[PDB]
């Protein structure tokens, strides 16, 4: 999930900007529901997650707001110690404590279209529900939610955010929201704000937040961090706030999810776009969204580490003059602007495999037999922070490579190029891969089938399930947005889909947007 808010000084038009981009997957019916709410003193247009009676991406009369879910630390696992004489008891503060017993029954439509009922029993400790046990030995694990029992209060806090009429009221609502989100805010008067909402527990300083906490009772939470200590900023001097699942602030720590926030994080794509420009506009944000949606993320940091090595050995390998040229020429993204069946930069294909070859030359020897559980760390979806620190000569706790960095970078260059020259061609045009397509499916992130999806193939894009581009002019919110696949998920009994079931896909694929409607005059002209 990405987002961006821009201050008046950093905005070209002078007015504050806001850009939404929640990555909650692509499904039909869509994960989001667009709506327009109006009433005396309340005019808000936007979209929220299906089911929520409040808008999360949009604007009211006074400000635009957006959100990004991420990987904050509101869930701790506790390693309970069990009683050898009674599995249903754990040591907690110098005494054995009986767990809770919860009986549950599930009706199941078995293989024969007739119902089937299964009985299960789940246990709960003081820290929360037990999720796993360990017969080797006398150990069980329970999950502590920092928000348990407060989901309803967070609903009202989000609804209160909708009803807010100024920043103070918006911040008061963010104060009450108990779960781990990032909230974004932009005023009609040019102010922007960012909040890393959620109630975050006060942990024992003597334990390791990356692994389960002992449940003996001497490492328990001690309250919740006051909201004022959460990451946040009101009108930052730099003029803007961007995010794409990264460290909120230098001071903020993550624990189990540290490997999501590293030196190589994809948010740098949005930072690069803001820093390369002066005062920006919505389309500039749209331009950065395009870059982000097609960026070869490894190319942002590693291509320079590659071009250098090749340049220092420019004379020892004739192929390097060409690679250097095609690498400096390539814009670090894999796009299909020419609308043929293939990506436009064959050197990206070389770079793809170069990385894959390079990643294994670092970790295969020591982590090869554990890629099933570690490769998602070392080849992470958002970046390869560790790999970069190794190749960038940065100090690491463990000595991964036993040779020089340039030797490996060339060993990967030569092997991949050798494979590409014999199997495809001598020049980059013959390396272009055919585009990867995606479809709006039937199963959402939560894992349940909620419809019939869509078979329409559209190019794969590292893009939000929805986009809003809102400028808060002195007259009210303004801009454009898109909410694929469509508003209505209804499918008639005979199979006829709603005329508004997929009428927003093509625009989503062709980077076209519909106008964001707010005042009554425009909404009547759209009907």
């Amino acid at each position: 999930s990405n987002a961006a808010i821009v201050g008046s000084e950093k905005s070209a038009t002078g007015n504050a900007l806001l850009f939404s981009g929640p990555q909650v997957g692509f499904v039909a019916p869509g994960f989001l529901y667009e709506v327009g709410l109006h009433a005396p003193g309340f005019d808000m247009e936007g979209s929220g997650f299906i089911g929520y009676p409040f808008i999360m991406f949009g604007a009211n009369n006074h400000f635009a707001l957006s959100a990004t879910a991420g990987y904050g630390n509101v869930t701790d696992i506790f390693e309970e110690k069990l009683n050898a004489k009674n599995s249903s008891q754990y040591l907690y503060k110098g005494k054995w404590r009986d767990m809770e017993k919860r009986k549950e029954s599930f009706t199941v439509k078995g293989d024969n279209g007739e119902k089937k009922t299964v009985e299960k029993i789940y246990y709960r400790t003081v820290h929360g529900p037990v999720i796993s046990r360990d017969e080797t030995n006398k150990v069980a694990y329970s999950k502590s939610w920092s928000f348990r029992g407060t989901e309803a209060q967070s609903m009202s806090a989000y609804m209160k955010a909708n009803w807010a009429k100024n920043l103070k009221e918006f911040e008061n609502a963010a104060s009450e929201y108990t779960m781990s989100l990032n909230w974004y805010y932009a005023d009609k008067k040019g102010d922007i704000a960012y909040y890393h909402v959620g109630r975050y527990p006060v942990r024992n300083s003597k334990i390791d937040e990356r692994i389960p906490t002992p449940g003996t009772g001497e490492y328990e939470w001690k309250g919740f961090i006051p909201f004022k200590e959460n990451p946040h900023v009101i009108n930052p001097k730099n003029g803007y706030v961007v995010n794409w699942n990264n460290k909120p602030s230098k001071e903020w720590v993550n624990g189990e999810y540290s490997f999501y926030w590293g030196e190589d994080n994809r948010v740098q794509q949005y930072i690069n776009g803001m820093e390369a420009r002066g005062k920006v506009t919505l389309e500039d944000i749209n331009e950065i969204n395009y870059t982000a949606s097609f960026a070869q993320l490894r190319a942002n940091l590693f291509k320079q580490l590659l071009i250098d090595v090749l340049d220092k050995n420019k004379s020892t390998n004739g192929n390097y003059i060409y690679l250097i040229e095609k690498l400096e020429e390539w814009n670090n993204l894999k796009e299909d602007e020419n609308k043929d069946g293939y990506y436009d930069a064959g050197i990206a294909a070389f770079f793809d495999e170069w990385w894959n070859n390079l990643h294994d030359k670092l970790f295969m020897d020591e982590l090869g037999d554990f890629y099933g559980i570690t490769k998602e760390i070392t080849d992470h979806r958002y970046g390869a922070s560790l790999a970069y620190k190794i190749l960038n000569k940065e100090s690491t706790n463990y000595k991964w490579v036993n040779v020089d960095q340039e030797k490996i970078i060339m060993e990967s260059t030569n092997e991949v190029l050798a494979k590409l020259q014999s199997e495809k061609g001598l020049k980059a045009e013959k390396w272009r891969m055919p585009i990867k397509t995606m479809t709006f499916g039937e199963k959402s992130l939560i894992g349940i089938p909620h419809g019939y999806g869509s078979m329409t193939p559209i190019i794969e894009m590292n893009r939000g399930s929805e986009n809003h581009y809102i400028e808060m002019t002195p007259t009210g919110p303004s801009g454009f947005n898109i909410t694929p696949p469509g508003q209505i998920g209804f499918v008639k009994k005979d199979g006829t889909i709603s005329d508004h079931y997929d009428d927003q896909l093509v625009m989503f694929a062709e980077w076209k947007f519909k106008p964001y409607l707010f005042n009554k005059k425009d909404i009547n002209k759209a009907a």
Binding site: P129, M155, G447, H450, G486, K493, Q504
Partner: protein
């Protein structure tokens, strides 16, 4: 606090733009237009948190239904927590469920034309909606973004590395894999 009346304007993309004279009516129509548009999706999202998807789609989703209930809440637990809300949010959530329930009734009276094909194919009927159901549909998604057990995956990675390289070398790798700080990570906050 008993009368009603809301206008609904549908644009060229089908988005409902609602115009009420009070929030109680606004949030009633809010839940109606959404049920009219996404009834089966709402049904199945509620079933996800309720642990009732196996009733419809079989034993493939038993494990999911089992997880949402062992970590979830009962109806009484949710009703207790809705009862702890401020007056207005509690009532507008209720009117929201009434809006959904309004269309559920409307569909059951004209099933051929106002009940989606999924209900016909898997022959079952949508249930009425209370404030509990609205909260469950909120929990089914929002909690997915905070719920995890990555801590236990970190302990697994650390153990397999210890059985392979010993405690000394294994902790070094782990501190590089699942690091404690990384002071050069890009941040969203920078300049006061």
């Amino acid at each position: 606090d008993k009368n009603e009346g809301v206008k609904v304007v549908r644009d060229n993309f089908g988005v409902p733009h609602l115009y009420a004279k009070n929030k109680k009516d606004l949030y009633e129509a809010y839940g109606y237009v959404m049920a009219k548009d996404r009834l089966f999706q709402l049904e199945m999202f509620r079933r996800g948190n309720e642990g009732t998807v196996s009733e419809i789609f079989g034993e493939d989703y038993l494990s999911k239904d089992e997880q949402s209930r062992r970590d979830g809440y009962s109806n009484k637990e949710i009703k207790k927590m809705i009862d702890g809300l401020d007056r207005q949010p509690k009532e507008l959530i209720a009117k929201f469920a009434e809006g959904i329930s309004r269309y559920v009734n409307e569909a059951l009276k004209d099933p051929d034309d106002k009940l989606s094909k999924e209900f016909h194919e898997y022959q079952f009927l949508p249930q009425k909606w209370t404030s509990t159901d609205v909260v469950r549909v909120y929990m089914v998604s929002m909690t997915y973004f905070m719920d995890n057990h990555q801590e236990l995956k970190n302990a697994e990675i650390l153990a397999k590395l210890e059985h392979e390289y010993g405690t000394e070398v294994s902790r070094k790798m782990f501190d590089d894999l699942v690091w404690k700080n990384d002071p050069s990570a890009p941040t969203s906050i920078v300049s006061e």
